[PDB]
Amino acid sequence: STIPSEIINWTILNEIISMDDDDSDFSKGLIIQFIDQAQTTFAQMQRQLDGEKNLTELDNLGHFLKGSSAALGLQRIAWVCERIQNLGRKMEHFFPNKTELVNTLSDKSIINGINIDEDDEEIKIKDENSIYLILIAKALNQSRLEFKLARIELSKYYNTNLH
Numbered sequence: 001s002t003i004p005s006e007i008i009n010w011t012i013l014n015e016i017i018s019m020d021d022d023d024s025d026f027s028k029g030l031i032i033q034f035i036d037q038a039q040t041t042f043a044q045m046q047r048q049l050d051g052e053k054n055l056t057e058l059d060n061l062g063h064f065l066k067g068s069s070a071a072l073g074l075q076r077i078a079w080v081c082e083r084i085q086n087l088g089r090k091m092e093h094f095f096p097n098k099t100e101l102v103n104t105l106s107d108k109s110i111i112n113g114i115n116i117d118e119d120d121e122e123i124k125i126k127d128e129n130s131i132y133l134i135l136i137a138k139a140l141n142q143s144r145l146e147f148k149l150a151r152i153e154l155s156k157y158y159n160t161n162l163h
Contacts, residue, residue, distance in 0.1 A: 004076055006106050010073065031162065042143065045084075045140055055129060059084075062082070063081075080142050083139050084139045087139060094135065098142060118145075118148070120141040123137045123141075151163040
């Protein structure tokens with residue numbers, strides 16, 4: 001879908017970076033804070049898919065990660081979280097396949113050598129909500145991929161391997 005083609009919204013990130021002048025490890029410090037939050041919420045979302053299967057929970061978790069990511073200019077992660085929310089509210093009723101989404105990327109050189117299904121959890125989910133939980137579970141595996149690309153991409157600029 002209309003996922004943004006650029007991994008990073010530089011007009012937002014440049015403004016965070018501007019403040020690195022008086023604080024050397026500032027922007028990198030936010031990024032590294034985000035990388036831990038993201039990993040934690042992905043696991044909390046995965047715990048719900050496999051357990052309570054509460055669509056309000058997956059809405060709130062999608063809400064949290066959408067604010068964090070959107071703040072650092074990580075706009076493809078934010079878009080997927082927005083879908084996780086709308087899917088949990090049954091206001092949207094489908095989610096694209098990985099290939100369709102990966103194909104919108106401004107520069108696909110960033111997926112050289114990596115296996116776009118590396119980080120997938122098997123979707124083991126029958127109920128009226130069953131289809132929304134399956135599509136959230138698809139959106140999460142796309143979120144994990146977008147997370148990784150965000151890390152690879154930020155490494156170019158922070159001169160360290162951010163994953």
